[PDB]
Design brief:
The complex is a heterodimer of chains A (about 160) and B (about 45). Chain A is of the alpha+beta class and about 160 residues long. Chain A has one domain: Phosphoenolpyruvate Carboxykinase, domain 3, CATH 3.90.228.10. Chain A has 4 helices and 6 strands. Chain A has a two-stranded antiparallel sheet. Chain A has a two-stranded antiparallel sheet with strand order 3-5. The longest helix of chain A is centred in the middle third of the chain and has 16 residues. The radius of gyration of chain A is 16 Å and the shape is globular. The N and C termini of chain A lie far apart (about 40 Å). By secondary structure, chain B is an all-beta fold. Chain B has a single domain, classed as YefM-like fold, CATH 6.20.320. Chain B has no helices and 3 strands. In chain B, a hairpin with an 8-residue loop joins strand 1 and strand 2. Classes of the chains: A alpha+beta (about 160), B mainly beta (about 45). Chains A and B meet through strand 2, helix 2, strand 3, helix 3 and strand 4 of A and strand 1, strand 2 and strand 3 of B. The structure holds 2-(4-piperidin-1-ylphenyl)-3~{H}-quinazolin-4-one (9B2) and zinc ion (ZN). Zinc ion binds next to loops of chain A.
């Protein structure tokens, strides 16, 4: 039930999503090992993901969380990179999309920095890089990220390196 | 998947060393995220 709607680059919505993508690039402590060496992106397309069942699933849970947290869902817009982005847009997030070995346990991880999520597009640690050239810093191959609406509710604060 | 810490719905990973890093977040229920936008891009080679 998923349809993808292209946003025009003239659309204020395209422009605000592109700005969040570009403005949250940072340098990484791996010198670009996982995600590549870059300061900015060439945005090729931004599509709205429309699925009524997946949206209702989201809003149902959001209401449950809000009601447990003084009517505050603590909703953020956050990036997610994964080799399974095609599966996610069609079937939704679930336990198959969890990072079992993540620093904060087996859950689904999201980043404020788009460049952090970019490190996961080709797998954990960038995997072996792009499928065509096996290059984690490939400047040719098209990459995809998700910019996601995320309900945090009451969030446990972990200070960490 | 693991469970959220008791009394919580997510975990926030606050950076404590790299002053320029932004936060990362973890949810333990797939229903707590909706994939709103699919962004197709290339990384650019610095000049
Ligand atoms: O965007 C992120 N994706 C991922 C990510 C990590 C792992 C995976 N998988 C997908 C299921 C197969 C095993 C590993 C998918 C996404 N981890 C992050 C960690 C910190 C901040 C952001 C991310
Ligand atoms: Zn490539």
């Amino acid at each position: 039930g998923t349809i993808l709607i292209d946003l025009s680059p003239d659309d204020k919505e395209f422009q605000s999503v592109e700005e969040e993508m570009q403005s949250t690039v940072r340098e990484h402590r791996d010198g670009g090992h996982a995600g590549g060496i870059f300061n900015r992106y060439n945005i090729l397309k931004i599509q709205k993901v429309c699925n009524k069942k997946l949206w209702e699933r989201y809003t149902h849970r959001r209401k449950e969380v809000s009601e447990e947290n003084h009517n505050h869902a603590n909703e953020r817009m956050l990036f997610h990179g994964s080799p399974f982005v095609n599966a996610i847009i069609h079937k939704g997030f679930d336990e198959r999309h969890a990072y079992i070995g993540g620093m904060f346990g087996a859950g689904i991880y999201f980043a404020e920095n788009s460049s952090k999520s970019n490190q996961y597009v080709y797998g954990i640690g960038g995997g072996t890089g792009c499928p065509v050239h096996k290059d984690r810093s490939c400047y040719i191959c098209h990459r995809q990220l998700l910019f996601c609406r995320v309900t945090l509710g009451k969030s446990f604060l972990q200070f960490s390196a | 998947m693991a469970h959220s810490p008791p009394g919580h719905h997510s975990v926030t990973g606050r950076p404590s060393v790299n002053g320029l890093a932004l936060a990362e977040y973890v949810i333990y229920r797939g229903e707590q995220a909706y994939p709103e936008y699919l962004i197709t891009y290339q990384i650019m080679r610095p000049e």
